[model samples]
Target: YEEKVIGQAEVRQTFKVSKVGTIAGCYVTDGKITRDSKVRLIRQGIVVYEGEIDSLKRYKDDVREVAQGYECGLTIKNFNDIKEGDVIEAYVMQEVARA
Candidate 1:
């Protein structure tokens, strides 16, 4: 996936996922996202949001996770800033976590 814009989601909105049973309105800015994948929202090089991916989506359609080069409405619980250029990254733990 190569980072395409998939519209925007506000600070407060409800998108019901009947399958995965989670709801969030946001974007997958970078990398592939899969269920239970670690993720973070970075702004100004600071992590504003950090948690395991509860769910991922491409419109009403559900996905396991999103990858680099793809964009979708992502539900990141307890996250803020539906801001422009807020970097979303799928974390590769182990070495990345320790480093």
Candidate 2:
């Protein structure tokens, strides 16, 4: 199996804390943002952090997915270096079958 990207978003704000992980405030620029999607943090065209989506929320409510043009808050599991203007690429693994 391999991972395939489904969505991309731009970070508008970054909420950092000592106890909790960093939360990225972003707006979907290409596709939908899902809770089960894997994420890559890109800054200045370089890949910074690659991890799974720890949490996905809209306003104060948890959600399964956020469509394009919508704003949402997301966290990267075990990562806390997210920054503003960064790009979040969301992807999922797809199984490839061989005959």
Candidate 3:
């Protein structure tokens, strides 16, 4: 079976992280998310930023992943046009064959 994990988070705020460039404070509204998960930014139901996750952290500590209802700061690789109220989503793609 082919399985996938999809997660959506709303941008609580957006700010520059000094040497880390632009990042967004997000609250995971749906599924789980991870550092290597594929991510995209959505504004007004339209997708604005789509790229890989460059960094994921909680406060100043690096984390492997984050789950629903939790908050984390993440930086999108190469895409920086983020703003408050923007919706962000992350997903994992997997392929499974029948046994």
The residue pairs that clash in candidate 3, if any, are none
Q: Which residue runs does candidate 1 get wrong by more than 4 Å?
A: 1-31, 80-85, 93-99
lDDT tens string, model 3, 1-99?
Answer: 433545568777765756766666678876655676777778886887887677777786876567758888777677658557487787666421111
Task: Mark the 10 consecutive residues where model 2 has the least summed lDDT.
Answer: 90-99
Q: Cα deviation in Å at residue 7, candidate 1?
A: 19
Task: Arrange candidates by TM-score, descending.
Answer: 3, 2, 1
TM-score of 2: 0.76
* Candidate 2 lDDT tens digits, 23-92: 6767787656777677776888688678777777778698777775887887867665756747788776
Per-residue lDDT of model 1, residues 28-51, tens digit only: 444455555555555676766666
lDDT at 85 for candidate 2? 48
- In order, what lDDT does every prediction score? 0.50, 0.70, 0.68
Each candidate structure's count of clashing pairs? 12, 0, 0
Top candidate (TM-score): 3
Query: If candidate 3 were superposed on the true structure by all CA atoms, what would the RMSD be?
Result: 4.4
TM-score, candidate number 1 = 0.53
Put the candidates in lDDT order, highest first. 2, 3, 1
Give the deviation of candidate 1 from the true structure as CA RMSD. 8.1
